[PDB]
Specification:
By secondary structure, this protein is mainly alpha-helical. The chain has 6 helices and no strands. The chain has one domain: Bromodomain-like (Histone Acetyltransferase, Chain A), CATH 1.20.920.10. The longest helix is centred in the C-terminal third of the chain and has 18 residues. Bound molecules: the ligand CCOc1c(OC)ccc2c1Oc1c(OC)ccc3c1C(=C2)N(C)C3=O. Belongs to the BET family. It is found in: Nucleus; Chromosome.
């Protein structure tokens, strides 16, 4: 396993916005409770899951546990930076797998719910 993505970085500037607060309180914390959220709640453990190929394929890993910690740390500058991490998480799953796979059906459902929730953000 590679080290997981950073959740703090002292030389990166922090920020808190209404949209970032919403991304934690509403978007992440609601998606977290979905029946399909469990594979996406922590970094992929390639040793545990017996996927020695995972990090040979996926070079920018991302997961909701990392995103949650970043939001709690005020790690992001703006909501778009956080949204990009969600999009990276979804696209990694499409890249690593193939259409119709159970894990892909899970990501597809979560992506739709994510888009529903971010369609309208606070001002
Ligand atoms: C059966 C293992 O389930 C787990 C799980 O278990 C604690 C924890 C994380 C994952 C996971 O499953 C899979 C797969 O399973 C065959 C196949 C592909 C992917 C994942 C996955 C998340 N991601 C992100 C994938 O791209």
């Amino acid at each position: 396993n590679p080290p997981p993505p950073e959740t703090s970085n002292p030389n990166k500037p922090k920020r808190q916005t209404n949209q970032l607060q919403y991304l934690l309180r509403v978007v992440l914390k609601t998606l977290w409770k979905h029946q399909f959220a469990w594979p996406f709640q922590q970094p992929v453990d390639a040793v545990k899951l017996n996927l020695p190929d995972y990090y040979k394929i996926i070079k920018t890993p991302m997961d909701m546990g990392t995103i949650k910690k970043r939001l709690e740390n005020n790690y992001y500058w703006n909501a778009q930076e956080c949204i990009q991490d969600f999009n990276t998480m979804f696209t990694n799953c499409y890249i690593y797998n193939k259409p119709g796979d159970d894990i892909v059906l899970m990501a597809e459902a979560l992506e739709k719910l994510f888009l529903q929730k971010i369609n309208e953000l606070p001002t």
